[PDB]
Symmetry: D2
Subunit: 215 residues, 4 copies
């Protein structure tokens, strides 16, 4: 069952350029509205020496507003839940691999997240912390070999005006057999609404809505 | 830029080293973001590859831009603009294309070059197993004083599933224009009729610019 | 600081498609001959559900024969040691990210390794365990922004015949300031010499030699 | 075939939309893996891009093959072979090229097409900041009954550092020939002389096949 008001609990363990860190979060969202927010706390490896923005899209497509005409792969997967894997290939060769194992306990989603980024150059916008925010995005979702894929090419706006491109490849895997959707889209907008100076505390929001594009 | 505009084009190209040429005439409504055209294979027919790889090469002036997004393309006329594009398919087939667009009265004139390589003999392009392009959402952003366009899209396949392609486009106005912020263009391109070997093709496209997840005030 | 005969001790912690595992190894090698061998034992997450081959090039370029005329970035970095990071981008979309922090204790190199692979399709050669061996390879090494890079586009041989390609991007980072080499190459040949049925025990060998390619 | 062979080619192409044409004549020793040629720009000069992006497009028959490795290329004659290639530079510039190689007496005849797109205005190609290709080691392997070649190589830059490029080549014999095992070809290509705007270029290449890490002193 998925209620109008759900909660979120997560732990991320990870590393960037070989340097370990760990983050925990608690939050709330409205799955039928495609909106969520959460408060994140760095527990290990702080102060983080890399742009926090590379982490935020790893911190659940159940928080997406799906219209009746499009099959909802994610709300179907519960109570058993689903997992996802993702590669995030930035244009300067930095690459982040991430996984999230999502379970449900009562009215609370539980995330077990792993995050590993390598080859971020010392003078690039990530290690120099010169990212501003992710732009809004439109993810493309499609079935391949019985599971759901999501591809998007998006970008971070940089301090000073420019953009830093990143290519997302996600595989979504329900833990139980669910009915699969047709090719469709998910519009996203993720935003850090508040943070302290070294990002030990972050309030993170996301809004997402599925659609089928131009008719 | 009038409410009703005409299109005239010629494409010269090659796929896997085998040359061909296509000419087209069409019409469209630039402010409604809609256009259609009839295309004729002039050389190299019958084409031995999936026609679909050509269709997104057969003009973002035909995109409905809201007042609230700066229109790079309508600004560039009468002088016009040019674009370059690489289309990177997931099985390694790669197509490079260019279009130099000028304006003659109410008619846009395209001079197009198209070169595709490394399409495997047993793949969906050389075996014409494509059905259509899905609708897409392109991302547009400024780099080095010109406009770029990236989109990861896909062709639907004859037996199910999809065949992915990554587009990288560079748009270059021929005169100085005002650059627009990061935005999107939704597309849907469709073959609306064709004869058996695709020597004749009726092609339509609909495109609308927008700024992503924000209208519903009723 | 670099003896003709050196030993190896390592622990790898990692995950493939979200399923964690851990492996430890002990070995020995001859840095000036560019040869090494090691025994690896599955400690957690066995029996491994993926092709063991994707791990082996993560199980140290100090074990490469460098001529006098090519600066040896790796033997220079000791006793302080060096670290490396790597992406391994397979042609079907599977991606493995790995890091190795290498230290030296007496005559023993100590590796702390992390390995994370995602998006390997269920019907692909990795999850179906259809790999035979890595082919011999030639890595290209060059300086960028004060550190050393290594790129190579190798392949794994498959059972029914054919090859499964992988693009390697490695960054090597000495822990101290060392002299930087010119553009050069390292030939590799890595081989699993013995293993038990589910690869809980693996004997792994590699041979490597640096060179500067066809002369000018 | 012969220990001494001649070469005559013509390349037609475009970079970032702008068209050009080059012709060349040369000679080489296929069993020694060495060749040289003189190239002349016939159209589109002075070339506004780094000449180096063209040179590896200007024939693996000029590679020294040991007896233990099957020679796909020397087998394909007199009928010849063709190849297609995509050259993917690290800043997004991409070049697609094809070469149809035939044999006329003792002269190889190349018909070459070259199309590069998305080279940024401030990058090393459009600013002519390349020095030379480094030596390389190509990996060759059979796929789909034809021969493939992959190599990740680099151009050295005029201010230091390197500019990377990933080559993907498909080699297609025109007749049925014997297929080789996975192997390598070492390359070293060099511009030995040129005039100021590269309308005239003397180009050399040396190439040798081998099987990777294998001097018994005799």
């Amino acid at each position: 069952v998925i209620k109008p008001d759900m909660k979120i609990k997560l732990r991320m363990e990870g590393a960037v350029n070989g340097h370990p860190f760990a983050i925990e979060g608690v939050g709330l969202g409205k799955p039928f509205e495609g909106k969520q927010s959460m408060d994140l706390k760095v527990k290990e490896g702080g102060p983080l020496p890399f742009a926090y923005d590379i982490l935020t899209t790893v911190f659940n497509r159940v928080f997406a507003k799906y219209p009746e005409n499009i099959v909802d792969y994610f709300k179907q997967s519960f109570p058993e839940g689903y997992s996802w894997e993702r590669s995030m290939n930035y244009e300067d060769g930095g690459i982040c691999n991430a996984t999230n194992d999502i379970t449900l306990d009562g009215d609370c989603y539980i995330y077990e997240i792993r995050f590993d980024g390598v080859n971020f150059p010392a003078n690039g916008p990530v290690m120099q912390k010169r990212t501003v925010k992710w732009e809004p995005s439109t993810e493309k979702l499609y079935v391949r070999d019985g599971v759901l894929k999501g591809d998007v090419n998006t970008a971070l706006s940089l301090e000073g005006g420019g953009h830093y491109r990143c290519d997302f490849k996600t595989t979504y895997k329900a833990k139980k057999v669910v009915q699969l959707p047709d090719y469709h889209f998910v519009d996203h907008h993720i935003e850090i609404k508040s943070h302290d100076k070294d990002y030990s505390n972050v309030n993170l929001h996301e809004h997402a809505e599925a659609h089928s594009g131009l008719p």
